[PDB]
């Protein structure tokens, strides 16, 4: 898993989360390109605990083209917690400590924000056509919704 964090003040947290590729419809950020970036962030302010916003929306499906590069972002802008990002085809309801093995592509637990810094990371997906979710393993934040679905067809 990925478990290399990088720090960033909020103006450098904005500026990544408006690099995120997709194009929102309904409640779905949709992806094209050979190479597409995911931002995410768990819990931006103004959005409910705990759960990812993407491009701007609450645990959004996001739909991705079978044969994509996957750039993905994930941010930690939730002071006080950490949150993980995992991505992983087993599906809701989740445990207390979500049973999501395989986890195909994603991070450890992340520090919690400090010093006036968030910290995130960048990792490298290349799915294969099918349904899968990205969930938080922190006990109990799955069970309480931190998660979404993605569709790579
Ligand atoms: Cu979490």
Request: proline letters at 9%.
């Amino acid at each position: 898993l990925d478990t290399t964090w990088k720090e960033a003040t909020l103006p450098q947290v904005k500026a990544m989360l408006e690099k995120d590729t997709g194009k929102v419809s309904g409640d779905t950020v949709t992806y094209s390109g050979k190479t597409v970036h995911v931002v995410a962030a768990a819990v931006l302010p103004g959005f409910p605990f705990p759960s990812f916003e993407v491009h701007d929306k609450k645990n959004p499906t996001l739909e991705i083209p079978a044969g994509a590069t996957v750039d993905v972002t994930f941010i930690n802008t939730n002071k006080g917690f950490g949150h993980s990002f995992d991505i992983t085809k087993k599906g809701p309801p989740y445990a207390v400590m979500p049973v999501i093995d395989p986890i195909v592509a994603g991070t450890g637990f992340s520090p919690v924000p400090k010093d006036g810094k968030f910290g995130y990371t960048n990792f490298t997906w290349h799915p294969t056509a099918g349904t899968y979710y990205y969930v938080c393993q922190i006990p109990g934040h799955a069970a309480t919704g931190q998660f979404g679905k993605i569709v790579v067809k």
